[PDB]
């Protein structure tokens, strides 16, 4: 039986690889604060102030904290990872487990100066999941708060909060509010523990690989087309310019003009930024050149976009401007941190099926031509789908989330996130937590007013969380060595992926999912 | 239904992202404007900046008219100004068209030309009769997940910035499907269409 | 097989339909040009302006080459005004491209 | 088994809507105090004072609490009223279920000016309903302390007392004073829990 | 069942010496403090100081401490010694068997300068072992910190840490980070007990 002196469950850290599952679990030890003294609050800002029309928002703040495990270092360790992303073409989730377990519930006094903090053994905390899915998703927005990607860490679980429409800093008939303490949730003490189960629908495997083939390269190098183009519409070698229509097969001599049967994928542009400075132009770019698209009045920011190269062969210094993930380098601020603390993730890889995404799809022509009239080629700058049309999802990284949940609505096409992960209609349910509130003393006479002095209090505890993924294994009669995931061979003065003198944990570099190669 | 929440502002209010985007590429409060690159993480300061996983349905715009009078423009531009589609050397009026938001916020008056369906109030003539015989229809619960029909779809850049070249960037009038995108097909009304037959085609897109 | 109708002919040509349009945005034969907005119900008169449900299928445009020499420029735009699509800073001509009518 | 360091229920608060039947359910936190340093104590009002002969008053005011939610907004949210009163022309109760569960019980103390407070983890709590109606029945009247409107707030348990004839301020012979602790009530320690049913009788549907 | 009220299991010392077999059994009491803070933290030592090119080391230390019982002392009184050298030629380990009971937890704080100490009774502690030797081996390097060779004495859990590759005080890129919150573990609260069994392979006997 439960009680004070007994363990809820037990420290749990594994990878398991069995043939094509791989189980990974992972244990850590949480903190969770007494958020808006056990208030909701709305909470909003409007163009009254220095924001402008893209900034405002509505919402409501609770008392509830969340669980946020949607980032892959919480899952894996970078060794686990390189196992994976060296070994198989592909993964997917497939199951996950989830629980709570040895809650301590604290409550910390002030007297005088000193602090003070002792167990208290009757309090409880309420946890709920919504199953249904009827609340505001707030995971997949790539929010702090995820579980620590070294386990020795404690973390402090995130407030939970929403936006709703708005019409400037004010309200919509249309916004809702969501009281948490209106949904069925479990009550645990210390000697209780919390579990439940998840099945991840049927997804596609993310594809970790690299394509050995650029698309318009699939021919063959040797052989002729027994397609006609048309070469040269002008007689050649006289004397006078007289048109004439001459033809041509395509052959290994021009192949940029065989014909072919499949188109890059779409292409949404770019500003084009280099890392080296003298290059970039001299004034602020970064807000006013911006790709933006400009939703109910307000312009927001295209990040990190669609899925598009990130430059084209030998250009390393250029990069799109919003196309690409940033993570920081372990301790980087949060406002104006210079380049060399954040770590640009970059697509090679995907340069053989998809455009690059600072240069043009392509061009078309924009008149139609007369021998009084000459030709004149438009540039495509955006480029939606088209039929025969093949692409690349982005990749997904170490730090980079998961999933994320498709919206529910009448249509979508090829629903993958933006920023990398696995498109789920139903994700796994958010896991919401609070510490149930405790009055402090109410006054001897009765009064209506409901009581807003309560024990200052904080609860902590383990959570575990193990999903089980379904590999897809790699299988090629190339002849030549793989690319893999290395570390560097060359001393260094401290390991990578390893705490540093003073304890620190740190993530040198985004390691990205695609080393194997594929035929296209 | 309507959703209870815009397509971009499904984030956190709370809390910021780990993500970095490039918030300044010039030297802040220097003397001198060399450029450097400075990155930061969106917030709930900006949240015009944070990285989304989706994007707006897609979009092909439409003209304003407003049914303030003095607003429009004196000229007839119903059918010049339209938006047609050219198939087979004749231009067919777009109608209703994509489904797309009437109008943004606190605009009533204005609606997409050819954009919304438009219903006669009983008996009503069949030419030229007067805006107050008609029944607008319009999409209100849209904007969410929707563009605007009379607005662009969003900016994109036309050239590939050098020191000597000023960052150019055009509009998008016309968006097709991109990997994604999301949106919400047209309301059904007490008075319009029940069902259409999907044509049969080698193929389609979203047959609604 | 071809289909025996245009798609934007799929309607009926002997009756109205209930949808209105906008048909004139300014005051008609009035001394004055001031605006305002006149609805109609499209008919078998204006076919173009009825409302439909279908669009016409994705459109990539390409350039237009006459067999009838004289007609054509005088010039070589068979690669320069070609339409291309641009792969990895290769620019690789689009063939035979989107199916699209020939001609019309 | 109950224990210190076990639950004694779980959260609940629901609407199910299923055929003709609406099952409500709310759960909130309450705090009791201490009333009257556990005295009873005569409580009378008499027209010696600026008082009138209509605000005369002779009762007692006993150490116990009681709850109340007899108030719609207690069962109901606003939401779930709207589906109610849109949609059904008459509704009646059924049957109730009452629960009191997680019982902390605390023990304050002074020394100099600070404050502290400290579970005491062997004190009790007494329960009892009057099923046989024994009591002077003292819902029904709109005072205040019903359970909040809105699920996140704690409140405070009203007070119970009661009132008798009187003439003027003095009290007559047919005067009754009622000892609560003369009923069996039930002793509840912070593992224990306490729980009844009870069913309605059969009454004509509110006409909405 | 176990509660904080009830002991986990019994002292136990004993020779038991019958035919060819001695089981030789010793209980301690230890205390286990908190090592770096819960910090696993780079050690190294390098030439640029006073040290030598022999003495530079890379490693990290733990907060994790063990058990050292390696020493014979622990496992043998003198007497027990003296029967063994003197009677026989030659003595082997069969199996062993460990355990952990009787689990105080006790957390200190500071007030002014006087210290108080008072049970937690919710507290945990994680013990595992390494059965697939996945991890530094770091006993039989004769370290100190076993269990005092006589039963009265209280004795303090060493802490844990590990060499690795370097070349000087910095890391090559064969050096290994293990982090032991990594491995399953087992956590006790003051009820609870850890026991495991271990059977020694076949070794020759020590000649004596
Ligand atoms: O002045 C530059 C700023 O312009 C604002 O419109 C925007 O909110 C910021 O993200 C930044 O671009
Ligand atoms: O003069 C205006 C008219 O122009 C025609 O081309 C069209 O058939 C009519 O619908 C109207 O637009
Ligand atoms: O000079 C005309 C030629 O231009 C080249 O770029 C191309 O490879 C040829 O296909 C042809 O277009």
Redesign the interface.
């Given at each position: 039986?439960?009680?004070?002196?007994?363990?809820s469950?037990?420290?749990?850290?594994?990878s398991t690889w069995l043939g094509d599952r791989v189980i990974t679990t992972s244990?850590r030890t949480w903190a969770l604060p007494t958020y808006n003294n056990?208030?909701?609050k709305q909470?909003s800002?409007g163009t009254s102030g220095g924001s402008?029309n893209?900034?405002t928002?509505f919402?409501y703040?609770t008392?509830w904290g969340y669980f946020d495990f949607n980032?892959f270092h919480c899952h894996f360790?970078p060794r686990d990872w390189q196992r994976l992303i060296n070994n198989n073409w592909g993964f997917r989730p497939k199951r996950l487990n989830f629980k709570l377990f040895?809650?301590?519930v604290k409550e910390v006094?002030q007297?005088?100066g000193?602090k003070?903090?002792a167990?208290?053994?009757?309090?409880?905390i309420?946890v709920?999941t919504d199953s249904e899915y009827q609340l505001?998703?707030?995971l997949?927005?790539?929010?702090?708060?995820?579980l620590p990607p070294?386990?020795?860490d404690?973390f402090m679980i995130?407030?939970?909060?929403?936006?709703?429409?708005?019409?400037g800093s004010q309200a919509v008939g249309?916004?809702?509010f969501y009281?948490l303490?209106?949904?069925?949730?479990?009550?645990?003490?210390?000697?209780?523990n919390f579990e439940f189960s998840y099945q991840f629908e049927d997804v596609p495997f993310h594809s970790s690989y690299a394509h050995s083939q650029?698309?318009?390269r699939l021919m063959n190098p040797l052989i002729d087309q027994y397609?006609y183009?048309?070469?040269?519409?002008?007689s050649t070698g006289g004397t006078a310019?007289?048109?004439?229509?001459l033809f041509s097969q395509a052959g290994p001599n021009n192949m940029?003009?065989?014909?072919?049967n499949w188109?890059?994928?779409?292409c949404?542009?770019?500003?084009?930024?280099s890392?080296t400075?003298?290059?970039?132009?001299?004034?602020?770019?970064?807000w006013?050149?911006?790709?933006?698209?400009?939703?109910?009045?307000?312009?927001?920011?295209?990040?990190?976009g669609?899925?598009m190269?990130t430059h084209?062969?030998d250009e390393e210094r250029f990069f799109p401007?919003?196309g690409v993930?940033?993570?920081?380098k372990q301790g980087?601020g949060?406002?104006?941190?210079?380049?060399s603390?954040?770590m640009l993730t970059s697509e090679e890889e995907i340069?053989?099926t998809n455009?690059?995404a600072?240069?043009?799809?392509?061009?078309?022509?924009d008149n139609?031509?007369?021998?009084?009239?000459?030709?004149?080629?438009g540039?495509v700058?955006?480029?939606?789908?088209?039929?025969?049309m093949v692409?690349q999802?982005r990749d997904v990284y170490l730090?980079g989330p998961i999933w994320?949940k498709?919206?529910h609505?009448?249509?979508?096409?090829?629903?993958?996130?933006?920023?990398g992960?696995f498109?789920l209609k139903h994700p796994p349910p958010q896991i919401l937590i609070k510490n149930?509130?405790?009055?402090?003393?109410?006054?001897?006479t009765?009064?209506?007013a409901?009581?807003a002095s309560?024990?200052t209090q904080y609860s902590t505890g383990?959570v575990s969380v193990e999903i089980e993924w379904e590999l897809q294994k790699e299988n090629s009669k190339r002849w030549n060595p793989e690319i893999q995931y290395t570390?560097?061979?060359?001393?260094?003065?401290?390991?990578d992926?390893?705490?540093?003198?003073?304890?620190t944990?740190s993530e040198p570099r985004p390691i990205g999912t695609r080393y194997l190669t594929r035929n296209l």
């Open positions: 039986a439960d009680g004070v002196g007994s363990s469950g037990n420290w749990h850290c594994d244990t056990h208030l909701y909470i800002n402008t893209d900034n928002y919402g703040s008392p980032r360790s040895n809650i301590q006094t007297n005088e000193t003070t903090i167990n208290n053994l009757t309090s409880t309420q709920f505001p998703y707030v997949g927005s790539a929010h702090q708060g995820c070294f386990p020795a404690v995130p407030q939970y909060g929403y936006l709703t429409l708005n019409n249309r916004s809702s009281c303490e209106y949904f069925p949730s479990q009550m645990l003490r210390t000697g209780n650029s698309l318009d397609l183009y048309l070469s040269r519409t002008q310019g007289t048109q004439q229509l940029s003009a065989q014909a072919k188109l890059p994928g779409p949404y542009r770019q500003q084009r930024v890392t400075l003298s290059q970039n132009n001299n004034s602020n770019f970064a006013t050149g911006a790709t933006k698209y400009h939703l109910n009045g307000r312009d927001s920011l295209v990040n990190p669609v899925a190269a084209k062969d401007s919003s993930l940033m993570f920081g980087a949060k406002d104006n941190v210079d380049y603390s954040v340069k053989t455009p690059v600072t240069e043009q799809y392509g061009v078309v022509a139609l031509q007369q021998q009084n009239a000459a030709p004149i080629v540039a700058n955006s480029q939606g789908a088209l039929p025969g692409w999802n730090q994320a498709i919206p609505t009448d249509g979508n096409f090829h629903p993958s996130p933006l920023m992960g498109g149930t509130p405790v009055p402090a003393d109410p006054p001897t009765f009064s209506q409901k009581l309560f024990i383990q570390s560097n061979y060359y001393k260094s003065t401290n390991v992926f390893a705490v540093n003198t003073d304890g944990y």
